[PDB]
RNA sequence: CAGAGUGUAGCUUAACACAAAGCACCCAACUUACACUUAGGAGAUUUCAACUUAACUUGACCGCUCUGACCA
């Protein structure tokens, strides 16, 4: 007795008539990447994340935060690209990079992060610590 | 059968006999490669002989010295004369003789009188039933006037096409237009005779091919002609 | 489990493999490169291999044959005796390919002959009558062949 | 005293940890993540970020890896996490960029060995 | 392009130094090769049998 | 195996190493451009041949079939690399002979 | 020359923004060679404006493909 599958087979899409023509992984890293990308996808069979992964309510996480500020992406990108252009033109920076002895200002990068990407990392860290779950229900 | 006439053409090609002039950056590449060879290689017998002779002379029976042999070989080099890469055909821009532009590939072109106007095109021949396009190409090579050539033929599929229509003069229901198919070949040896040189054929490179070719014909030909 | 709809999800050998010349493509071809400069010969051989990989044409294998040493002997000045002058070594690099289209064969031959360096001689031919296929079989391949035979 | 997800001995990598450090070295960019075993990601340090792009010559070299390691070590020190695990393949472990990242973590004070669970 | 791989080096761990020399064929054409001795110009002789 | 044939190693200067690095990093771009040129020219030739073949198929199925049929004249072919100088039409080298040592 | 169609370096139903991303691709190291790996490099939103984020919505401009015009 055989019962038809409830969903597409994991290797149903790949043809086998020209498997010799099909390019192989030829490396472990590519297979690992494809494997993790596949594992990060939903499946119709029982899986580890079904039993051990946390379950979230289907409704989107409600936001109470300040509305996001607007910014000109084109101007921002132009200034960033000219800054990196001059940075790469600087030969001393290039020589330090090739000698693997260059150093970055930790205080400066942290101060800039606190204005650029700080809020999102802090929100993610608070969510990991579970504050948004206990308080605000 | 069909209102479109069928002609098979041949594109006679001669590759360079000598390597192209080296870019200065490639000369630097060669210099660095030889420098690495010298830095990473072991001592040759010539250098061992030179070192032994120098040490023995410093401390103090070899009649011939390593430096003397090097100088004699240099004298033999200056005595010997090499092939002149620059030729009289290069000096005169002789686009008909084979000894022009040894560094770059050359393509043959012939003159035909169509529509009361000479047009620079490749050799062509009408297609006949029961004979392949390569057979028609061989027949065109034979039809070429006073040429003794041997050409290497690669494959059978066409290398390109060019379609044209009659300028409302000979455009008829039976003969609407025509299409020509191009085939590549490699010239091993051969030459034309001295009877007809200027009015029969020319040999030119890809860069100046457009000077003789029509814009449309050149646009079609450049898809398969190269400059390597 | 066989009864359950997820039967066969664990199968993997159907994704793994368990010569005749067509009338449109050539079965097996061999390109032999002869040179007195082994470095240039091997460099052009590896260039051909890289181009074949880029063009997605199967390469059976790439190897080399033992070098044949041909000495140069010169006649002395004002004499009649033959004396050794220099020694030349002929290195041969062979690349065996399979599955080349006739339409693409002309393109491949043109590009390789246009990229052929100085002092190297190419010879592209069939090399199929001498394919004895007398190779030392590995343990799993020989065991699979024995299982098929028995 | 938290129980670790022991097992998975037939697959790589093992999941017996509380925090894992993952390194993704792409063609143009390099990312480092510190994430929990249940799936949640704690902290990140990616070369796409402008505060390090503006001072980084190239995002795909040993200097980039060193900068990412130092920045992530500082972020983890500020976040309070001190102990993690590192599960590299042998070739990427022998890779020079990753060992300099390990040196950066050590000098920043992050320890890549977790304390053993107290069963009794 | 004939110069695709004409500029290469020796990929060997142990070998003796070579020199840029010219080999002249039967018809006089010269090709650059490397030889143990600093014989810049060398020419192959013609064969007695091929007569 | 003798170490007498070994040579002393001349130390490289900092400017020399910098020049080596810069030349290598521009060689990378130069070879990338050369490979790009080869890729686009072979793609153009392939597309031109495909268009010519499809035009031939439209013109006549029989000529198309006999053109796509393989050729038995090909693949004895041999090609010799170019020389640095053109051959000398007037040249008589002395006599000689060859030997094989295995 | 006219009528329709199209637009991110090669590809992508990549781009919510925090950000122009992933892969292939190019060079050096190992290898006869290939491949893996390590260490390096090149890259893109065609250009102008619209209350403004706007590669993303609308125009003009620009660049390509298809069909008619021209046609040895």
Swiss-Prot record, chain A:
A Gene Ontology term for the protein's cellular component: mitochondrion
Top-level division of the source organism's lineage: Eukaryota
Parts forming coiled coils: 73-101
Keywords assigned: Coiled coil, Mitochondrion, Ribonucleoprotein, Ribosomal protein, Transit peptide
Annotated localization: Mitochondrion
Principal cellular location given in the protein's record: mitochondrion
Single Gene Ontology BP annotation: mitochondrial translation
Membrane-crossing residue ranges in chain numbering: none
Subunit comment: Component of the mitochondrial large ribosomal subunit (mt-LSU). Mature mammalian 55S mitochondrial ribosomes consist of a small (28S) and a large (39S) subunit. The 28S small subunit contains a 12S ribosomal RNA (12S mt-rRNA) and 30 different proteins. The 39S large subunit contains a 16S rRNA (16S mt-rRNA), a copy of mitochondrial valine transfer RNA (mt-tRNA(Val)), which plays an integral structural role, and 52 different proteins. mL38 is located at the central protuberance.
Family under the similarity heading: Belongs to the phosphatidylethanolamine-binding protein family. Mitochondrion-specific ribosomal protein mL38 subfamily.
Name this protein carries in UniProt: Large ribosomal subunit protein mL38
Gene behind this protein: MRPL38
Full protein: residues contained: 27 to 163 of 380
UniProtKB/Swiss-Prot annotation, chain D:
Molecular function GO labels: 5S rRNA binding; structural constituent of ribosome
GO CC list: extracellular space; mitochondrial inner membrane; mitochondrial large ribosomal subunit; mitochondrial ribosome; mitochondrion
Single GO BP term: mitochondrial translation
Subcellular location field: Mitochondrion
Keywords: Chaperone, Mitochondrion, Ribonucleoprotein, Ribosomal protein, RNA-binding, Transit peptide, Transport
Keyword Transport: yes
Oligomeric and partner information: Component of the mitochondrial large ribosomal subunit (mt-LSU). Mature mammalian 55S mitochondrial ribosomes consist of a small (28S) and a large (39S) subunit. The 28S small subunit contains a 12S ribosomal RNA (12S mt-rRNA) and 30 different proteins. The 39S large subunit contains a 16S rRNA (16S mt-rRNA), a copy of mitochondrial valine transfer RNA (mt-tRNA(Val)), which plays an integral structural role, and 52 different proteins.
Described function: Together with thiosulfate sulfurtransferase (TST), acts as a mitochondrial import factor for the cytosolic 5S rRNA. The precursor form shows RNA chaperone activity; is able to fold the 5S rRNA into an import-competent conformation that is recognized by rhodanese (TST). Both the cytoplasmic and mitochondrial forms are able to bind to the helix IV-loop D in the gamma domain of the 5S rRNA.
Similarity comment: family membership: Belongs to the universal ribosomal protein uL18 family.
Record's protein name: Large ribosomal subunit protein uL18m
Gene name of the encoded protein: MRPL18
From Swiss-Prot, chain E:
Compartments reported by the entry: Mitochondrion
Subunit structure comment from the entry: Component of the mitochondrial large ribosomal subunit (mt-LSU). Mature mammalian 55S mitochondrial ribosomes consist of a small (28S) and a large (39S) subunit. The 28S small subunit contains a 12S ribosomal RNA (12S mt-rRNA) and 30 different proteins. The 39S large subunit contains a 16S rRNA (16S mt-rRNA), a copy of mitochondrial valine transfer RNA (mt-tRNA(Val)), which plays an integral structural role, and 52 different proteins.
Name of the molecule in the record: Large ribosomal subunit protein mL55
Signal peptide: none
Disulfide bonds: none
Organism expressing this protein natively: Homo sapiens (Human)
Record family assignment: Belongs to the mitochondrion-specific ribosomal protein mL55 family.
Swiss-Prot record, chain F:
Name of the protein: Large ribosomal subunit protein mL40
Record carries keyword Ribosomal protein: yes
A single cellular component GO annotation: mitochondrion
Protein's cellular compartments: Mitochondrion
Keywords in alphabetical order: Mitochondrion, Ribonucleoprotein, Ribosomal protein, Transit peptide
Residue range from the parent sequence: 95 to 196 of 206
Family (UniProt): Belongs to the mitochondrion-specific ribosomal protein mL40 family.
Main location: mitochondrion
Region (Disordered): 74-98
Keyword check for Transit peptide: yes
Coiled coil: none
Species assigned in the record: Homo sapiens (Human)
Organism placement in taxonomy: Eukaryota, Metazoa, Chordata, Craniata, Vertebrata
Assembly, per entry: Component of the mitochondrial large ribosomal subunit (mt-LSU). Mature mammalian 55S mitochondrial ribosomes consist of a small (28S) and a large (39S) subunit. The 28S small subunit contains a 12S ribosomal RNA (12S mt-rRNA) and 30 different proteins. The 39S large subunit contains a 16S rRNA (16S mt-rRNA), a copy of mitochondrial valine transfer RNA (mt-tRNA(Val)), which plays an integral structural role, and 52 different proteins. mL40 binds to the major groove of the anticodon stem of mt-tRNA(Val) in the central protuberance.
Entry comment describing in which tissues the protein is expressed: Ubiquitous.
One GO term of the biological process aspect: anatomical structure morphogenesis
Transmembrane segments: none
A GO term, aspect molecular function: RNA binding
